[PDB]
Design an enzyme around this catalytic site. Structure first.
Site, PDB file in Angstrom:
ATOM      1  N   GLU A 163       9.592  13.563  49.308  1.00 60.83           N
ATOM      2  CA  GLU A 163      10.663  12.618  49.065  1.00 60.83           C
ATOM      3  C   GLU A 163      10.084  11.448  48.260  1.00 60.83           C
ATOM      4  O   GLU A 163      10.724  10.920  47.343  1.00 60.83           O
ATOM      5  CB  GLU A 163      11.220  12.126  50.396  1.00 60.83           C
ATOM      6  CG  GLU A 163      12.372  11.136  50.290  1.00 60.83           C
ATOM      7  CD  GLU A 163      11.920   9.658  50.233  1.00 60.83           C
ATOM      8  OE1 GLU A 163      10.702   9.374  50.303  1.00 60.83           O
ATOM      9  OE2 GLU A 163      12.803   8.774  50.119  1.00 60.83           O
ATOM     10  N   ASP A 210      16.326   8.126  57.881  1.00 58.40           N
ATOM     11  CA  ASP A 210      15.205   7.585  57.111  1.00 58.40           C
ATOM     12  C   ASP A 210      14.911   6.145  57.557  1.00 58.40           C
ATOM     13  O   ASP A 210      15.827   5.392  57.920  1.00 58.40           O
ATOM     14  CB  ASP A 210      15.516   7.633  55.593  1.00 58.40           C
ATOM     15  CG  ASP A 210      14.249   7.610  54.720  1.00 58.40           C
ATOM     16  OD1 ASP A 210      13.123   7.586  55.270  1.00 58.40           O
ATOM     17  OD2 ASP A 210      14.371   7.617  53.470  1.00 58.40           O
TER      18      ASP A 210
HETATM   19 ZN   LIG Z   1       9.023   5.670  51.881  1.00 58.08          ZN
END
Ligand SMILES: [Zn+2]
EC number: 2.3.2.5
Length: 323
Positions: A163, A210
């Site tokens: 990511e 997240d």
């Molecule tokens: Zn990060």
């Protein structure tokens, strides 16, 4: 042509009563998650590294020991990077593969690459070791109920690789795993044998976790086409709170606030959102103070906050799946 891809627009949750909520709060163990799912992930695990491999084996092993009929897939591919061609591997865990619809929970398991600095190593505790552990703890905690799935709707977990950018964020340097998986799913007929529907049409909702684990997170309601689900998170947090099932928690300091965030946040949901997938982005704003810092470690995690969110999320998933 069947209108099944539209079912997600009308899907309603099957709401748990007080007694059920008490049962879900009791069924999750923050200490168990801490020792069995989180600590093994608090290691350097940027793409291609020994740790990436170790993390992937940890995640797969913890899912494989569960009674539920999880089908694990490793989606490995190559991509150009600022350091030349490299290999990446997304981890996808799916209950009822041929199930037309799936509620999807996701996060990234790679950790941002940083060369060791003064003997310190970046392990991205909130980013996103905790989200990873939260997904594992949810699979474990709801295992018996998920087993009963063995509405043509089931569950899927995605652990994205890469990511993070290798340098600083750029359109080409970041979101390696999700840009790749979104494209693959968009071009894969679903259910098997389908004429014009893809795996993406099958995605009821992408719930991406997240930067979770810091104290006092505040999650904004980012998208109108997932606003009603953000509302459900608010209601669940509120009820668990009123029942006294949350720890060190107050409504004034609630996590799911009544506010929007117009701007764009670069994350794994982007490739899915731009292809029409509904997204419920569970990332806080502002970001944790330790964000992309050697201090994003275990010491700075807020245990009770993570515990509270495990209960909220687990209740959300059960209600969504009518379990
Ligand atoms: Zn990060």
């Amino acid at each position: 042509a069947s209108a099944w891809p539209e079912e997600k627009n009308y899907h309603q949750p099957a709401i748990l009563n007080s007694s059920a909520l008490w049962q879900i709060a009791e069924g999750t163990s923050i200490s168990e998650m801490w020792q069995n799912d989180l600590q093994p992930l608090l290691i350097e695990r940027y793409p291609g590294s020994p740790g990436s491999y170790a993390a992937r084996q940890h995640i797969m092993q913890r899912i494989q020991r569960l009674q539920a009929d999880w089908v694990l897939e490793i989606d490995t591919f190559l991509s150009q990077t600022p350091y030349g061609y490299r290999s990446f591997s997304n981890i996808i865990s799916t209950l009822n593969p041929t199930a037309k619809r799936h509620l999807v929970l996701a996060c990234h398991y790679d950790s941002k690459y940083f060369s060791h600095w003064n003997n310190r190593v970046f392990v991205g505790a909130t980013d996103s070791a905790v989200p990873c552990a939260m997904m594992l703890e949810l699979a474990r905690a709801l295992d018996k109920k998920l087993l009963s799935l063995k509405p043509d709707l089931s569950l899927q977990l995605i652990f994205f690789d890469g990511e993070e950018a290798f340098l600083h964020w750029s359109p080409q340097d970041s979101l390696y795993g999700s840009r790749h998986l979104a494209a693959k799913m968009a071009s894969t007929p679903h259910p098997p044998g389908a004429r014009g529907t893809s795996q993406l049409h099958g995605m009821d909702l992408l719930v991406l976790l997240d930067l979770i684990g810091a104290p006092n997170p505040t999650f904004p309601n980012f998208f109108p086409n997932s606003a009603r689900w953000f509302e459900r998170l608010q209601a669940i947090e509120h009820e668990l709170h009123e029942l006294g099932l949350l720890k060190d928690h107050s409504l004034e300091g609630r996590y799911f606030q009544n506010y929007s965030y117009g701007g764009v946040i670069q994350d794994d949901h982007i490739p899915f959102l731009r292809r029409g997938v509904p997204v419920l982005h569970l990332i806080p704003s502002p970001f944790p103070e330790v964000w992309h810092t050697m201090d994003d470690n275990e010491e700075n995690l807020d245990e009770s906050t993570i515990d509270n969110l495990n209960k909220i999320l687990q209740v959300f998933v059960l209600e969504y799946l009518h379990l």
